[PDB]
Amino acid sequence: FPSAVTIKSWVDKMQEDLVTLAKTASGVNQLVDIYEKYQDLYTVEPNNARQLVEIAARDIEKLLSNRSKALVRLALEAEKVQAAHQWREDFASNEVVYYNAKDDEPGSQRIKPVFIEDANFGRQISYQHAAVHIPTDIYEGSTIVLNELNWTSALDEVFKKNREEDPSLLWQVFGSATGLARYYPASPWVKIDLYDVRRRPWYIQGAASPKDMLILVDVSGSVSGLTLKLIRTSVSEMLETLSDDDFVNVASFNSNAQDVSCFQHLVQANVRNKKVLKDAVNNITAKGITDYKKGFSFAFEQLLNYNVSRANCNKIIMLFTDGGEERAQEIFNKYNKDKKVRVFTFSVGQHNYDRGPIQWMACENKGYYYEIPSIGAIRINTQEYLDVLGRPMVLAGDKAKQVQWTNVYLDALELGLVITGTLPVFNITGQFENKTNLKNQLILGVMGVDVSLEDIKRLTPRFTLCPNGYYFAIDPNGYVLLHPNLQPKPIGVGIPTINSQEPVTLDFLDAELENDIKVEIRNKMIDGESGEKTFRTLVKSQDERYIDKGNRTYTWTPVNGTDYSLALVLPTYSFYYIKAKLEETITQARYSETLKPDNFEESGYTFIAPRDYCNDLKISDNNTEFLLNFNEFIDRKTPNNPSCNADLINRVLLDAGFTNELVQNYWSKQKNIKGVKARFVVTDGGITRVYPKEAGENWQENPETYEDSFYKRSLDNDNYVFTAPYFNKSGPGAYESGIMVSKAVEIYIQGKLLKPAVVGIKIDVNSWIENFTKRNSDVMDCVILDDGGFLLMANHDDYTNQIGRFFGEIDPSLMRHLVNISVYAFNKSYDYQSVCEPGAASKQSCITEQTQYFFDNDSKSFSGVLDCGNCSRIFHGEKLMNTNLIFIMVESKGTCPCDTRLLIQAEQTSDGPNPCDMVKQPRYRKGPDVCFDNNVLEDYTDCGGVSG
Amino acid sequence: GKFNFDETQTKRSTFDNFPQALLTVFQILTGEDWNAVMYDGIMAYGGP
Amino acid sequence: LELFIGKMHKTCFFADSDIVAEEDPAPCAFSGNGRQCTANGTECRSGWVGPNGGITNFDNFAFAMLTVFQCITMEGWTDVLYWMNDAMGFELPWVY
Amino acid sequence: QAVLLLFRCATGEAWQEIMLACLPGKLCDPESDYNPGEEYTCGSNFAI
Ligand SMILES: *[C@@H]1O[C@H](CO)[C@@H](O[C@@H]2O[C@H](CO)[C@@H](O[C@@H]3O[C@H](CO)[C@@H](O[C@@H]4O[C@H](CO)[C@@H](O)[C@H](O)[C@H]4NC(C)=O)[C@H](O)[C@H]3NC(C)=O)[C@H](O)[C@H]2NC(C)=O)[C@H](O)[C@H]1NC(C)=O
Ligand SMILES: *[C@@H]1O[C@H](CO)[C@@H](O[C@@H]2O[C@H](CO)[C@@H](O[C@@H]3O[C@H](CO)[C@@H](O)[C@H](O)[C@H]3NC(C)=O)[C@H](O)[C@H]2NC(C)=O)[C@H](O)[C@H]1NC(C)=O
Ligand SMILES: *[C@@H]1O[C@H](CO)[C@@H](O[C@@H]2O[C@H](CO)[C@@H](O)[C@H](O)[C@H]2NC(C)=O)[C@H](O)[C@H]1NC(C)=O
Ligand SMILES: *[C@@H]1O[C@H](CO)[C@@H](O[C@@H]2O[C@H](CO)[C@@H](O)[C@H](O)[C@H]2NC(C)=O)[C@H](O)[C@H]1NC(C)=O
Ligand SMILES: *[C@@H]1O[C@H](CO)[C@@H](O[C@@H]2O[C@H](CO)[C@@H](O)[C@H](O)[C@H]2NC(C)=O)[C@H](O)[C@H]1NC(C)=O
Ligand SMILES: *[C@@H]1O[C@H](CO)[C@@H](O)[C@H](O)[C@H]1NC(C)=O
Ligand SMILES: [Ca+2]
Ligand SMILES: [Ca+2]
């Protein structure tokens, strides 16, 4: 059995045949010389993290203050215009004119628009008027609707006025409390249509305040049958009217009150918790007798907890019963004598039981009474409780006219991830002489204006930062308004099983890897205090395959106007960047000559990053034609750059020649090398090149350099990086592509570190194998692995066929045992935005758990004994010097015919984490400081059952 | 209180209280759709 | 019992599913003689429970006696006749 | 089939339902030689 000395000696001759080849074929030292040879075509500039955040935060504040002025202008006019309405009841003669959307009329006349297609808008829109959306379950032409369609016609002038001042304005919509929504600009509405403006997340937050809701469900015997099905559906539809700022819990009672789920107290009612409550509600049975005294005492006790995090706001109890005889007068006097809790009572089902006590409990406690006799009445009755909650808000006056911003959600008109402003509109008719005050305690509606996140991304440029640097903003709840990992997909819960209304609320600790320091940083941004911190963490790569440890510098400041906090993740070696300063014409024209598509025969195949170089230039998302447009534009235009930035073009043009000089001076000397298949260079400017043009068809990497997985991993590692190919016929990558190597160039201009590009070569697997023979033995096993346990080449003629595959899926016995020796650490994370094929009860959103592996200890000489049971298999492991590779040699599997369960490193569809215990120690959060409830002037003299 | 097994509709010819039971017995006595009431009573105790 | 036993057990579901096509199901032909369910996508096979949930059928002596007693009182005899017209052929059930 | 329908009505099974189904506003089968364009014509008030 070979000793450790001879194995290290054989390894020393192994990496020296790879490092030297990569150091010479790629020309990493030649590119360093080229950058340092000139030192005058560009200039190094400081990248102060503190300056950037205070500047980017101000720009976001100004953008969100331009939108607030548009809401105040709209809300003020609607209150003024509505007060001058007459409420006529005959529209046959003087019909109202409007454009009803979702169409191809007793008292209305339609409008046929022109609908020119527009940029920054996925649909055909018209700015001449405003469209109107009337839900299917509401009949247009009723007296209420037509009256609302007349006085709202004065908003179209204000719609045009706002768009004149700020042409980059998205949908402006007025959500009427009567159901109809009028939005601008007019665009046709997008199966049946179930849209209702009053149930939208942006409407609900402006119609009321956060609430400490609690639901009482009658599960006594008399509710068995149809009326239990209605009760379960009504509870489910009522949970859909709660947001992340509202706290809910569901309890039942049948001769004994108990919780229906695992929570036992109020929870945040986010997307994950509502899914648990809905499952618990949908699994209840009716049995026993009714006791209202016992049920209400339980409800009042959970609203007095105060050990747990709540909203400290509207406290409401909703009773889902059918009928009864007990009034529970003693319970109400004992618990709420001062009417601090509102009680909303529902009479669900078709029955003839006594509704007297149910109606009495409602208005004796500042509540309201609702009837749900059929399925069609569920949706309209579970959303009408926001009129009662909005009574104290209208009595506040101007103190309640504050602009709020929702969570990130997918737009209902196919626009992407957006956020919406919000401002309620009051009914102030007859308020001049102050005598009516009868129906003047209900809001007219809610105004909203959309701010796309792509608009936010334009205010935080990232091209002067390294590919490892980025911006991110955090909501007071903790969710990320802006983040690289945030994707335009709904966040999933559980596992889909079959026999986009919810917001995309991604927590900060879920977007990236969780850490003890990052928890403290997250808390410091929530409570709005600026600061900075540098520290060392381990960073997941672009793909879920590798983890590398690096240094980062988190700088955060709060946005003054809003409640958001903006942070900048600027790594080391990124505080300085190259600023191109070229002014001479012929020295700029020659650089552009290399980008001609017909010049690839001597400069190599060339890609260019589809950045927003100039406004009239348009991206094509394929780069087959984008390169044609780019180089036929710069010549077909004056070099003064009249309407587009020279900074983003001077970088790409200067880097065009810096890589160009490498090809002829060093790469062209070696036309072909024995062990090298392709040579590539990727540059911060946004260009990549491949010298062998016939091998340029195998470049599947994204043209945008900032999104390249290998680029970001190479900057962090001081040594060379080996990237394993994909498996299971994931395109051509097995033998015709090769093994990728990378090494980021490092330059020192004036003692400052810069990493402007990465260079590498594709190692030929066929020639690499010949370095082991210089084979297929049944006595000993030899494999090579990278940082992450992926096979790169072997000597068994079956291992090499399964190339680029995780070691745990081909030899779990040694792989599982290796982790115990602490050679390979690992971290498990959940991906809340991922689609997977549903299991037995298309694709649906689901949570997938990802794991990655990395080197744990810095020591290289590893040895041990693998005891699979009733036998043994000695092994020795050596890590290649100055390379992320590890060489491990073990006795062949023929001696020990054992095979444990394979250790899979892939996206495992999991339902975790369990939320029954996250509520016990919830993440820190800060609630809204506004609270509009319990106004003494509130009327609440209408029970709701007196008129029903 | 045993005809609550459909969960999709409410039956009118039941035995929930005395007037309704009396009406149901009268209807069976006249022989009009007594088979429907018999089927409901059979399903109320399991099934076929 | 002798003439027709277990023949009202074949309605038309959808394509490779356990969900019946129409909300008022009626049996198909037993051997290509009775009603044929011809819709957009519909093939009919066994496994159905029965017309009245399994209460009205002739696949047992108790079931046959109950069905005969129901028919002898002139209450719902046409329903059974039509169900047998759908399931079995068209010429025998009217005589019975 | 007409005689069977009359026997069913004599038994009194759903005779009023057929009577309602025989009112004028009924669709005609696409086999009678009716005037093109109009097909909801067969049926008469004689049914009652
Ligand atoms: C803002 O608040 C003002 C008041 O503060 C409110 O204006 C009031 O509107 C109502 C109609 O909704 C007017 O009522 C008048 O008198 C009776 C009673 O409502 C109506 O007669 C019937 O009323 C029932 C009520 O449900 C209705 O269903 C029915 O269709 C009516 N007609 C019948 C049965 O034939 C009158 O029709 C109605 N109008 C008249 C007499 O012209 C109040 O008089 C209005 N108050 C004031 C001071 O003008 C206004 O709607 C609120 N804003 C919004 C957007 O709702
Ligand atoms: C609610 O509906 C009402 C019925 O149409 C509207 O009231 C009508 O508005 C018309 C448009 O201005 C008026 O016509 C002209 O109005 C101007 C303004 O003072 C004047 O030139 C004349 O009064 C009039 N010209 C004529 C009649 O030749 C109607 O007079 C007016 N009243 C009616 C038709 O009874 C309301 O405007 C509408 N509410 C809103 C907010 O638009
Ligand atoms: C938000 O506003 C606060 C105060 O209004 C700003 O705080 C300033 O902080 C600097 C140093 O950090 C001080 O020199 C100033 O005197 C402070 N301002 C005031 C008015 O005292 C903060 O900079 C603002 N943030 C942004 C992003 O604009
Ligand atoms: C938290 O709620 C508990 C009951 O749910 C309150 O009662 C106390 O519970 C803790 C836990 O053992 C102990 O202090 C005593 O057993 C209880 N009484 C007192 C007077 O503490 C408790 O008061 C609530 N608040 C806190 C801070 O525990
Ligand atoms: C991610 O992986 C790291 C590295 O394996 C783990 O953190 C280690 O935790 C143990 C105790 O639980 C400590 O002894 C180690 O020092 C930690 N490693 C460090 C700090 O590098 C853990 O599995 C994950 N880290 C988390 C969840 O924070
Ligand atoms: C909009 O915001 C910008 C800053 O982002 C500000 O300069 C401008 O005055 C605002 N208003 C308009 C109409 O552009
Ligand atoms: Ca009861
Ligand atoms: Ca009858």
Coordinates of C-alpha atoms in Angstrom, one line a residue, chain A residues 592-801:
Chain A
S592 CA -14.4 49.5 -32.6
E593 CA -12.9 47.8 -35.7
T594 CA -12.4 44.6 -33.7
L595 CA -16.1 44.3 -32.9
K596 CA -17.1 43.8 -36.5
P597 CA -18.7 40.3 -36.9
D598 CA -16.7 39.6 -40.0
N599 CA -13.4 40.1 -38.2
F600 CA -13.7 37.0 -36.0
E601 CA -11.2 35.0 -38.1
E602 CA -8.3 36.8 -36.5
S603 CA -9.7 38.2 -33.2
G604 CA -11.9 35.3 -32.2
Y605 CA -15.6 35.0 -31.5
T606 CA -16.9 38.0 -29.5
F607 CA -19.9 38.6 -27.3
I608 CA -21.1 41.9 -25.8
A609 CA -23.2 42.5 -22.7
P610 CA -26.7 43.6 -23.5
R611 CA -26.5 46.7 -21.4
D612 CA -28.4 50.0 -21.9
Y613 CA -25.6 51.6 -23.8
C614 CA -27.9 54.2 -25.6
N615 CA -31.6 54.9 -25.5
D616 CA -32.4 54.3 -29.2
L617 CA -30.3 51.1 -29.1
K618 CA -32.6 48.2 -28.2
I619 CA -31.6 44.8 -26.8
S620 CA -32.6 41.6 -28.4
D621 CA -31.8 39.0 -25.7
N622 CA -29.9 36.7 -28.2
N623 CA -26.7 38.6 -29.0
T624 CA -26.8 37.2 -32.6
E625 CA -28.1 40.5 -33.8
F626 CA -27.4 42.8 -30.8
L627 CA -23.7 42.9 -31.8
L628 CA -24.8 43.9 -35.3
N629 CA -26.8 46.8 -34.0
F630 CA -24.1 48.0 -31.6
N631 CA -21.2 48.3 -34.1
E632 CA -23.4 49.7 -36.9
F633 CA -24.6 52.4 -34.5
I634 CA -21.5 53.9 -33.0
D635 CA -20.1 54.6 -36.4
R636 CA -23.5 55.7 -37.7
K637 CA -23.6 58.5 -35.0
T638 CA -21.4 61.4 -33.9
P639 CA -18.9 60.3 -31.2
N640 CA -20.2 63.1 -28.9
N641 CA -22.9 60.7 -27.5
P642 CA -25.7 63.2 -27.7
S643 CA -28.4 61.3 -25.7
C644 CA -26.5 58.5 -24.0
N645 CA -23.8 58.0 -21.4
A646 CA -20.1 57.9 -22.5
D647 CA -19.0 56.2 -19.3
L648 CA -20.7 52.9 -20.1
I649 CA -19.4 53.0 -23.7
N650 CA -15.9 54.2 -23.1
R651 CA -15.5 51.1 -20.8
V652 CA -16.6 48.6 -23.4
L653 CA -14.6 50.2 -26.2
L654 CA -11.4 50.5 -24.1
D655 CA -11.7 46.9 -23.0
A656 CA -12.3 45.9 -26.6
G657 CA -8.7 46.8 -27.4
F658 CA -7.2 45.6 -24.1
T659 CA -8.4 42.1 -24.9
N660 CA -7.6 42.6 -28.6
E661 CA -3.9 43.2 -27.8
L662 CA -3.9 39.9 -25.9
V663 CA -5.0 37.8 -28.9
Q664 CA -2.4 38.9 -31.5
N665 CA 0.6 39.6 -29.2
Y666 CA 0.3 36.4 -27.2
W667 CA -2.6 34.1 -28.2
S668 CA -2.0 34.3 -32.0
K669 CA 1.6 33.0 -31.5
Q670 CA 0.2 29.6 -30.4
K671 CA -2.4 28.7 -33.1
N672 CA -3.1 25.3 -31.5
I673 CA -2.0 23.7 -28.2
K674 CA -2.1 20.0 -27.5
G675 CA -4.0 20.0 -24.2
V676 CA -6.1 23.2 -24.7
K677 CA -9.5 23.2 -26.5
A678 CA -10.6 26.9 -26.1
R679 CA -9.2 30.1 -24.6
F680 CA -11.6 32.7 -23.3
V681 CA -11.4 36.1 -21.6
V682 CA -14.2 37.9 -19.8
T683 CA -13.9 41.5 -19.0
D684 CA -15.8 43.9 -16.6
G685 CA -16.6 46.2 -19.6
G686 CA -19.1 43.6 -20.9
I687 CA -17.3 41.6 -23.5
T688 CA -16.0 38.1 -23.8
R689 CA -13.8 36.5 -26.5
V690 CA -13.0 33.0 -27.6
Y691 CA -10.0 32.6 -29.9
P692 CA -11.0 29.3 -31.6
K693 CA -14.0 30.4 -33.7
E694 CA -15.1 26.8 -34.3
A695 CA -15.1 26.4 -30.5
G696 CA -17.1 29.6 -29.9
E697 CA -20.3 27.7 -30.6
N698 CA -19.8 25.8 -27.3
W699 CA -20.0 29.0 -25.2
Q700 CA -23.3 28.7 -23.4
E701 CA -22.5 31.3 -20.8
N702 CA -24.6 34.5 -20.6
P703 CA -23.1 37.4 -22.6
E704 CA -23.7 39.6 -19.6
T705 CA -20.5 39.2 -17.5
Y706 CA -22.2 40.2 -14.2
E707 CA -24.4 37.1 -14.4
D708 CA -21.6 34.6 -15.1
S709 CA -21.3 32.0 -12.4
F710 CA -17.6 31.3 -13.0
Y711 CA -16.7 35.1 -13.1
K712 CA -18.1 35.7 -9.6
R713 CA -16.4 32.6 -8.1
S714 CA -13.0 33.4 -9.7
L715 CA -12.8 36.9 -8.1
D716 CA -13.2 35.5 -4.6
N717 CA -10.7 32.7 -5.0
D718 CA -7.0 33.8 -5.0
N719 CA -6.1 30.5 -6.9
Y720 CA -7.4 28.8 -10.0
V721 CA -11.0 27.6 -10.1
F722 CA -12.3 24.5 -11.8
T723 CA -16.0 24.4 -12.9
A724 CA -17.5 21.0 -13.4
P725 CA -19.9 20.5 -16.4
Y726 CA -23.5 19.6 -16.1
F727 CA -24.9 16.1 -16.3
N728 CA -27.7 14.1 -17.9
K729 CA -27.4 15.4 -21.5
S730 CA -27.8 19.0 -20.4
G731 CA -26.6 20.1 -23.8
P732 CA -23.2 19.4 -25.3
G733 CA -20.7 19.6 -22.4
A734 CA -19.3 16.1 -21.8
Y735 CA -16.4 15.6 -24.1
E736 CA -16.7 18.3 -26.9
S737 CA -16.6 21.2 -24.5
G738 CA -13.9 20.4 -21.9
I739 CA -13.1 21.3 -18.3
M740 CA -13.3 25.0 -17.6
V741 CA -10.5 26.8 -15.6
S742 CA -10.5 30.4 -14.5
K743 CA -8.2 32.9 -12.9
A744 CA -9.0 36.6 -12.2
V745 CA -6.2 39.0 -13.2
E746 CA -4.8 41.2 -10.5
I747 CA -3.2 44.6 -11.2
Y748 CA -1.6 47.3 -9.0
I749 CA -1.9 50.7 -10.6
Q750 CA -0.8 52.9 -7.6
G751 CA -0.7 50.3 -5.0
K752 CA -4.4 49.6 -5.5
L753 CA -5.8 46.1 -6.1
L754 CA -8.1 45.7 -9.2
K755 CA -9.6 42.6 -10.7
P756 CA -10.9 43.8 -14.1
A757 CA -11.1 40.5 -16.0
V758 CA -10.9 36.7 -15.7
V759 CA -9.1 34.4 -18.1
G760 CA -9.2 30.7 -18.5
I761 CA -8.9 27.7 -20.8
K762 CA -11.0 24.6 -21.4
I763 CA -9.0 21.5 -20.4
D764 CA -9.5 18.7 -22.8
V765 CA -10.8 15.6 -20.9
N766 CA -9.3 13.2 -23.4
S767 CA -5.8 14.6 -23.1
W768 CA -6.2 14.9 -19.3
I769 CA -6.9 11.2 -19.0
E770 CA -3.6 10.4 -20.8
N771 CA -1.8 12.2 -17.9
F772 CA -2.9 9.4 -15.6
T773 CA -1.8 6.5 -17.8
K774 CA 1.5 8.3 -18.3
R775 CA -6.0 2.7 -15.5
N776 CA -9.3 0.8 -15.3
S777 CA -7.9 -1.2 -12.5
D778 CA -10.0 -3.4 -10.2
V779 CA -7.6 -3.0 -7.3
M780 CA -7.5 0.7 -6.5
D781 CA -9.8 3.7 -7.1
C782 CA -8.5 7.1 -8.1
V783 CA -10.7 10.2 -8.6
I784 CA -10.3 13.9 -8.6
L785 CA -12.8 16.3 -7.1
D786 CA -13.3 20.1 -6.9
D787 CA -14.5 22.4 -4.2
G788 CA -18.0 20.9 -3.9
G789 CA -17.4 17.2 -4.5
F790 CA -18.0 17.1 -8.3
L791 CA -16.0 14.6 -10.4
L792 CA -13.7 16.1 -12.9
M793 CA -11.9 13.0 -14.3
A794 CA -11.0 9.5 -13.2
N795 CA -9.4 6.3 -14.4
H796 CA -12.2 3.7 -14.4
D797 CA -13.8 4.3 -17.8
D798 CA -17.2 4.4 -16.2
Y799 CA -16.6 7.2 -13.7
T800 CA -15.3 9.4 -16.6
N801 CA -18.5 8.7 -18.6

